[PDB]
């Protein structure tokens, strides 16, 4: 009873797409295309970020440098950072890449997590031609391949998946997978799981979707307050009330800030400034105050979107002057997370 234990109802969104030239053949994701402006006309030549030491695809700079997500020693350090933050579940981005380098990374992550008693669940992304049939096939593959790993997450005996952009699939399709009567149901099978869909817009649209698709719960993802109805924290009390009334699990997503203008220069309206951690505090406070049973954190290391709690350091190159953690130390967002985990556990 030290107040330092991992919390297993706290989920931190984790990305394993970073590479080094040495380990992966390229500085993967540190190099990144610059997205054209959706409202910016037809002849755009936006360019790319080369992913050199001076110029990486983030408005911030990692304390660990241009790391490889395949590097066992980087993984060990990340797991130690999870321990520091008291975040007991790593929610791994999963893009269905069906290649051996990804299979290797997933094994390394599970192994490194287990050494620190961290758990892993999968964040199922909108991969090409994703539909309920191949989703089932991939759920089967993941549970079969990893269900016996000691680090594989379970809640009251069930695996848990977050489904990004779930709303892109019709409720009549979801019901085949998620209804107890569905033609390809996972309910009452070896592959049953808590399915947590992405709540985006207004209750008028989202309430029937969640009910008719038979999702077990919902999350909101976006670190930038106000980006969607779901990511507007003043809605969370109301959202929790509905969740409780309808037997659903609400897992609001909290983040320390947002900025993606290195890769999306036209997207400045979505910037949310960290102000020495006050933004993080405000958002985490709203989640706890809503009376939820679980909280998700956006993100551990989505460096592109500037939502990361992973330690960042001050850096000025000839190419760019990076943002940093201002008056706070590089590990401030890890220790502040630990602080909020404590408060969460206090009132659970
Ligand atoms: O405009 C860039 C925007 O893209 C991403 O969000 C998109 C999508 O995933 C979401 O489902 C909807 C919800 O309204 O919005 C976009 O279409 C995110 O990367 C976001 O942070 C970013 O601003
Ligand atoms: O994990 C859910 C959701 N979060 C924000 C992004 O990480 C998004 O993925 C895409 O955008 C990133 C850059 O922010 C890009 O590098 C990646 O290729 C896209 O998939 C993700 O689905």
From TrEMBL:
Which InterPro entries does this entry report, sorted A to Z?
A: Glyco_Hydrolase_99 (IPR026071)
Q: Which residues form a coiled coil?
A: none
The protein's GO terms of the molecular function aspect are: alpha-mannosidase activity
**Which keywords has UniProt assigned to this entry?**
Golgi apparatus, Hydrolase, Membrane, Signal-anchor, Transmembrane, Transmembrane helix
What's the main place this protein lives? Golgi
Q: Which Pfam families match?
A: Glyco_hydro_99 (PF16317)
Name its cellular compartments: Golgi apparatus membrane
Q: How does it sit in the membrane?
A: Single-pass type II membrane protein
Keyword flag Iron: no
Name the PANTHER family for this protein: ENDO-ALPHA-1,2-MANNOSIDASE (PTHR13572), RE57134P (PTHR13572:SF4)
This one is known as: Glycosyl hydrolase family 71
